[PDB]
């Protein structure tokens with residue numbers, strides 16, 4: 001909860017010169033991999049996508065966040081992502097872009113206030129800060145120093161509490177405080193809801209978040225504040241597991257990257273003497289198809305179909321695309 005090094009004029013100018021013609025950052029078919037390949041500075045192009053998405057929405061303007069404070073914030077986030085195969089700055093820009101499509105192509109903006117929409121798009125960019133490509137189980141199973149601190153401290157969401165700490169750190173500088181235009185009660189809601197949503201991305205809480213959302217949607221008018229809170233949690237979670245809702249070739253590129261992080265975690269566990277689950281073990285697997293089908297069947301397809309049928313009807317395309325992708329992997333297996 002303290003200062004960071006100031007963003008410079010030159011760093012800002014390097015983002016502002018990126019052009020992006022022939023991309024539409026609001027479209028469900030937008031391809032971040034093609035955007036990255038189109039230029040020799042893919043980190044500047046990724047920052048420009050986030051900047052143009054947020055400014056194009058009208059939300060920072062509504063809530064007192066200047067163009068310069070928004071760009072500073074995006075660049076402070078970028079500096080705190082690591083060179084890891086999947087949980088990097090590209091993943092969080094992808095989640096931000098995807099949530100924009102759920103809100104404005106899927107019409108989920110009808111269920112939320114404008115302030116809640118602004119907090120969601122901002123939260124997407126902080127939600128994995130300083131991720132080291134290792135999950136909560138790694139830290140606890142191996143007695144790594146952060147696992148010892150979680151054990152002594154109480155909380156088992158090692159990663160997600162860390163991400164929240166760093167978000168608070170970035171927002172402590174007035175030059176990058178995107179919530180500085182909010183007054184009293186609203187500023188408090190913004191921080192509380194950002195923290196709640198990030199803490200809800202721990203997949204150990206996947207089942208309990210889903211059930212609380214479906215219960216709150218069953219009678220919305222009985223408790224409106226609860227329904228709003230849970231809708232924000234469920235949309236960030238949906239963005240976070242959205243790789244299987246994309247055009248097949250895009251979906252496959254994401255799957256390759258996360259698979260490599262799984263294997264590297266297994267390698268590090270084996271080296272520290274722990275007996276690894278076979279999903280994380282290079283020596284126990286071959287092609288991607290069977291694992292993507294398993295992820296779809298046991299996690300993503302029931303999640304998306306349940307939230308769509310419960311009240312998010314405008315997001316039907318996600319279920320259709322998941323089914324299409326699953327059929328493509330199944331054809332790979334059958335041949």
Ligand SMILES: COc1ccc(C2=NN(C(C)C)C(=O)[C@@H]3CC=CC[C@H]23)cc1-c1ccc(C(=O)N2CC[C@@H](O)C2)cc1
Nearest residue numbers: 203240241243254255258259262279280285288291292295
């Ligand atoms: C698109 O693929 C994925 C997306 C998110 C995840 C995640 N799983 N999970 C749990 C469900 C295990 C997370 O906690 C991650 C962190 C936050 C949200 C979701 C993340 C896993 C896969 C996943 C990774 C690898 C395979 C796979 O095919 N493998 C992995 C190794 C071998 O079994 C082949 C399948 C699914």
Ligand SMILES: [Mg+2]
Nearest residue numbers: 127128159201
């Ligand atoms: Mg995460």
Ligand SMILES: [Zn+2]
Nearest residue numbers: 091127128240
């Ligand atoms: Zn994530």
